[PDB]
Amino acid sequence: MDYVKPEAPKEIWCIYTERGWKNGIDQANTILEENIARIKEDFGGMILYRKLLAMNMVSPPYVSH
């Protein structure tokens, strides 16, 4: 995940700054969960390829030199 330090900035100011803090934390967790899904996609697709090559449902790549 990408980090840049933000240096670019009272009765009810505190509670809404705190609510915005909770919203940002929740958004970051959601972004991480989609990244986890993407890496799982790539690894699971390759692993499934190995199983179907073993069970003779795909053809291997043929190479000429």
């Binding site: 967790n29 991480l32 986890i36 690894f43 699971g44 692993i47 190995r50 199983k51 073993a54 069970m55």
Partner: protein, 140 residues
Amino acid sequence: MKFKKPPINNPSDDATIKLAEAAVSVSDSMLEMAKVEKVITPPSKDNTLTIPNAYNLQARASVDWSGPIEELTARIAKAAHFRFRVLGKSPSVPVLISISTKDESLAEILRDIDYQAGKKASIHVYPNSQVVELRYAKIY
């Protein structure tokens, strides 16, 4: 009579929770497919024939390495007091290995390296001449 249940660990992060949940599913996919591959083509030969042991191959090591194969094999041979030999041409795309073990013998370190090398390189040991020999594949 305060009530308590035994595992009380340190607090956890939900990132680590999500990472663990992904890792478990990866793990049983790997287990099922490995079972299928073992059933389909049963192996017949073992690399104890090509790498037998000897005296002073029974010194021990613990290793954490994430680079190319040749320098690490040279370090093991130098620790075992053997000569080191290379056959064939090294490929342009390097052969990378990754070993993370604890307290095993040097013969098993070489056998694990030999298994991870795969179709790209091979390890042979001649104990009467005290030679460790790594040979590259005739590919490309």
